[PDB]
């Protein structure tokens, strides 16, 4: 069965960036996928996305603008202390000076850079570059 809908959504996006498409359609959608796409949007990694309202769970269509190399999920959502974040950014980011690791703190879903200036930590979701 479906174990996590975030992994399916990020697999769908990653497969269509490789093939050359400019849009995806993911199904289903959740608040976690909406927030993860919102973090991707504000850093310019994806374009506009529209949420189709079913009565079931909804679908999302996301416009792609090139310039995305990978969006991935980390399963399980490991607990990350505030001193372990630079052990993750060193592991699965291509360089020390771009790319983001998206976490889930009690202050909300956010990338690792402004989890640092907010001085919060939590569980890890994934990465984009």
């Amino acid at each position: 069965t479906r174990s996590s809908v975030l992994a399916d959504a990020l697999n769908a996006i990653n497969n269509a960036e490789k093939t050359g498409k400019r849009q995806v359609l993911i199904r289903p959608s959740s608040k976690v996928i909406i927030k993860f796409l919102q973090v991707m949007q504000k850093h310019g990694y994806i374009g506009e996305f529209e949420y189709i309202d079913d009565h079931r769970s909804g679908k999302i269509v996301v416009q792609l603008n090139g310039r995305l190399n990978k969006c991935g999920v980390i399963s399980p959502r490991f607990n990350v202390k505030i001193g372990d974040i630079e052990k993750w950014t060193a592991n699965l980011l291509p360089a020390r000076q771009f790319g983001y690791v998206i976490l889930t703190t009690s202050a909300g879903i956010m990338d690792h850079e402004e989890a640092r200036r907010k001085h919060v930590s939590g569980k890890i979701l994934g990465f984009v570059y």
Partner: protein, 185 residues
């Protein structure tokens, strides 16, 4: 006086103006004496439409929104002519209960009808009352604002076709959320 028995206790002068608009049809009464006698409302908010017009919001206690929906289309005609420069709509005064935090506990588990995301959905179902909604889309723009989109039924659309500009102003004043209405064919 039957004018004063519709409003809450005292207020207000504007509540009397709509109150006289009901009794001019209750005393005329082709058929309305059998259905407009028990129908009563709670309040009017005046919302400034972005055009030259304004909007009238009629709040209903909602054991009776089904009762109001029987004469909804006909009564709005006899409210727009004796109140010029206005658009009259009927809403239900729903209650929104706050989401319990990990400290702000309560008793009596909060029903899903009292959640805020369900009340705002019932506003759109009640703003437009005919022309059942056939879909919804939400655009997450690049800048960061969210724009809804309400798709309306194409049939019977000529009763509210001019009021799409008014509805976007009313829903913005009650929710703070942008709306565009689109009519597919």
């Amino acid at each position: 006086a039957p004018q004063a028995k519709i409003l809450s206790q005292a207020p207000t002068e504007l509540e009397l103006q709509v109150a006289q608009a009901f009794v001019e049809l209750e005393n005329s009464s082709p058929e309305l004496k059998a259905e407009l006698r028990p129908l009563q409302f709670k309040s009017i908010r005046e919302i400034d439409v972005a055009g030259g017009k304004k909007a009238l919001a009629i709040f209903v206690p909602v054991p009776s929104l089904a009762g109001f929906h029987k004469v909804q289309t006909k009564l709005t005609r006899e409210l727009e002519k004796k109140f010029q420069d206005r658009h009259v709509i009927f809403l239900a005064e729903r209650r929104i209960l706050p989401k319990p935090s990990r400290t702000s506990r309560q008793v009596q588990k909060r029903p899903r009808s009292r959640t805020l995301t369900a009340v705002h959905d019932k506003i759109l179902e009640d703003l437009v009352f005919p022309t059942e909604i056939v879909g919804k889309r939400v655009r997450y723009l690049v800048g960061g604002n969210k724009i809804q989109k309400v798709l309306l039924d194409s049939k019977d659309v000529q009763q509210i076709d001019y009021k799409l500009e008014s509805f976007q102003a009313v829903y913005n004043k009650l929710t703070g959320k942008q709306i565009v209405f689109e009519i597919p064919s």
